[PDB]
Amino acid sequence: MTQDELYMKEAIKEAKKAEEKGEVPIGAVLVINGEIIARAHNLRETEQRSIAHAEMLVIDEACKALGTWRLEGATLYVTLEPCPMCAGAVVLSRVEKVVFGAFDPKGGCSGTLMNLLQEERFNHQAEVVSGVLEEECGGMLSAFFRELRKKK
Amino acid sequence: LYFQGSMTQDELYMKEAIKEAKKAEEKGEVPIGAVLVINGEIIARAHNLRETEQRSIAHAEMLVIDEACKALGTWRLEGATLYVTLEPCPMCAGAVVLSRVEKVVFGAFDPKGGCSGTLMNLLQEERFNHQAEVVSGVLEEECGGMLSAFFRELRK
Ligand SMILES: [Zn+2]
Ligand SMILES: [Zn+2]
């Protein structure tokens, strides 16, 4: 397994902590110079905050852990293609690279509906690597929702 | 028939958002302010705090939206109107869309980064699960005037 896949495995572990809590299993880690300086998972329903996406939590924890808004040199690993809110946060925090697992054909804005991470009219663009452990990351979401309907 | 007059409701709310932007101004931030109203009352008010808190997501719209989510005990801000002095960026427009904020009223356009009309309009995206009603230009001159003052002093 490559370097990106290794770190996506830790984001996947985060995604499973969210499934444990009955959240959509989406996980994220933030890496600078080989160290995971923050990790987080979706908390939208446990905390009832529309903003508690895995990418926003890890970014805010990174900023707080580091005492800076500018996460220069950070790579964000997330199991799913960021939404526009999270893609915006990546741009605003100057994250250098985003690696995601599965594409989000419904709502992804780092390659599918649009690419807010590579918008040249913005003051920052991030490298984007897609499909890293795609089958595991996407299958996790499918099985979560399939298990959800089962509970009726 | 009457001697007195009035502001519209929208510009009364907008001038509370301007008040918040003035606080941001005196702290040396980009002077952007915001209020969130539901059921006819202001539930949350905030201003830009990126430098004060060293958090990239401390935009006025993000703060008031999170405050309202936390206060209301729900991620869904149904019926809410967001007043912000400046056109929302993509992070905040996304957060509007995710929280089902019903309407966004903003003052001045952001020619460089606005994503509620200028570069794009994330608030009126058919392909998203939710669209917000957008009203621009409310107290435009006062809202844009602070930004242009801020960025003129930056140039100098
Ligand atoms: Zn997101
Ligand atoms: Zn913003």
Side-chain angles (χ1 to χ4, degrees), chain A residues 1-15 17-18 21-60 62-63 65-71 73-95 97-105 107-119 121-146 148-149, chain B residues 2-14 16-21 23-25 27-40 42-69 71-75 77 79-101 103-125 127-141 143-151:
Chain A
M1 273 201 318
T2 66
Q3 169 167 25
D4 281 336
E5 287 166 342
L6 262 47
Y7 287 114
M8 187 71 73
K9 264 316 200 312
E10 314 278 12
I12 282 175
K13 288 177 186 102
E14 284 314 295
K17 287 174 186 165
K21 315 170 180 186
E23 305 267 350
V24 186
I26 296 177
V29 301
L30 200 282
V31 187
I32 302 176
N33 284 324
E35 213 88 279
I36 290 179
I37 63 108
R39 58 185 86 212
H41 50 260
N42 176 234
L43 294 175
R44 181 194 86 163
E45 300 256 348
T46 173
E47 298 184 9
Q48 283 296 306
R49 305 164 61 207
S50 65
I51 285 170
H53 284 202
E55 308 83 305
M56 305 280 317
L57 300 168
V58 85
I59 285 177
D60 202 46
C63 292
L66 294 159
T68 171
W69 63 264
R70 192 195 331 157
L71 310 177
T75 304
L76 161 76
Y77 295 86
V78 56
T79 54
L80 187 68
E81 179 176 0
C83 80
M85 168 183 81
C86 298
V90 167
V91 176
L92 288 164
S93 56
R94 311 271 164 178
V95 161
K97 181 203 260 173
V98 176
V99 178
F100 63 83
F103 291 98
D104 177 13
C109 303
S110 325
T112 301
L113 300 183
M114 59 189 61
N115 196 338
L116 294 178
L117 300 193
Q118 301 267 10
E119 174 51 81
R121 299 169 291 168
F122 292 169
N123 64 345
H124 173 75
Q125 300 80 29
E127 248 179 317
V128 185
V129 186
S130 40
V132 171
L133 299 186
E134 189 181 357
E135 295 82 3
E136 179 165 8
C137 291
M140 207 171 38
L141 302 160
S142 312
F144 172 79
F145 291 118
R146 189 171 306 182
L148 219 59
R149 304 160 206 146
Chain B
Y2 294 105
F3 189 88
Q4 303 93 357
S6 75
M7 314 248 271
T8 71
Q9 199 44 61
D10 277 352
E11 52 204 357
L12 289 182
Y13 285 129
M14 178 61 67
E16 303 290 301
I18 286 171
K19 287 167 181 181
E20 291 296 308
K23 313 171 169 187
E25 198 174 44
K27 306 180 200 183
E29 307 275 349
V30 187
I32 313 172
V35 298
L36 207 151
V37 315
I38 307 195
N39 282 308
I42 289 173
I43 317 188
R45 41 180 97 224
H47 46 274
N48 207 103
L49 284 182
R50 183 186 83 178
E51 315 287 16
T52 303
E53 304 198 320
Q54 290 293 321
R55 310 206 285 105
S56 43
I57 74 175
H59 287 197
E61 308 93 296
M62 295 298 276
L63 297 176
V64 310
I65 281 175
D66 204 29
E67 267 189 72
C69 286
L72 289 293
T74 186
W75 62 266
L77 305 177
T81 301
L82 166 73
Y83 295 76
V84 52
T85 54
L86 176 62
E87 172 184 3
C89 84
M91 181 187 59
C92 298
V96 161
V97 157
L98 292 168
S99 40
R100 326 265 181 261
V101 157
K103 172 167 62 182
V104 181
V105 180
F106 70 81
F109 290 88
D110 178 6
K112 191 203 176 169
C115 294
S116 318
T118 300
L119 306 175
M120 56 187 84
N121 191 348
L122 299 164
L123 294 190
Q124 218 83 42
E125 236 299 351
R127 293 173 299 177
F128 288 165
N129 62 88
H130 172 79
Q131 294 74 30
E133 168 174 9
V134 181
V135 180
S136 55
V138 174
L139 306 181
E140 195 167 356
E141 195 279 291
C143 296
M146 292 159 100
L147 289 139
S148 93
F150 175 90
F151 285 109

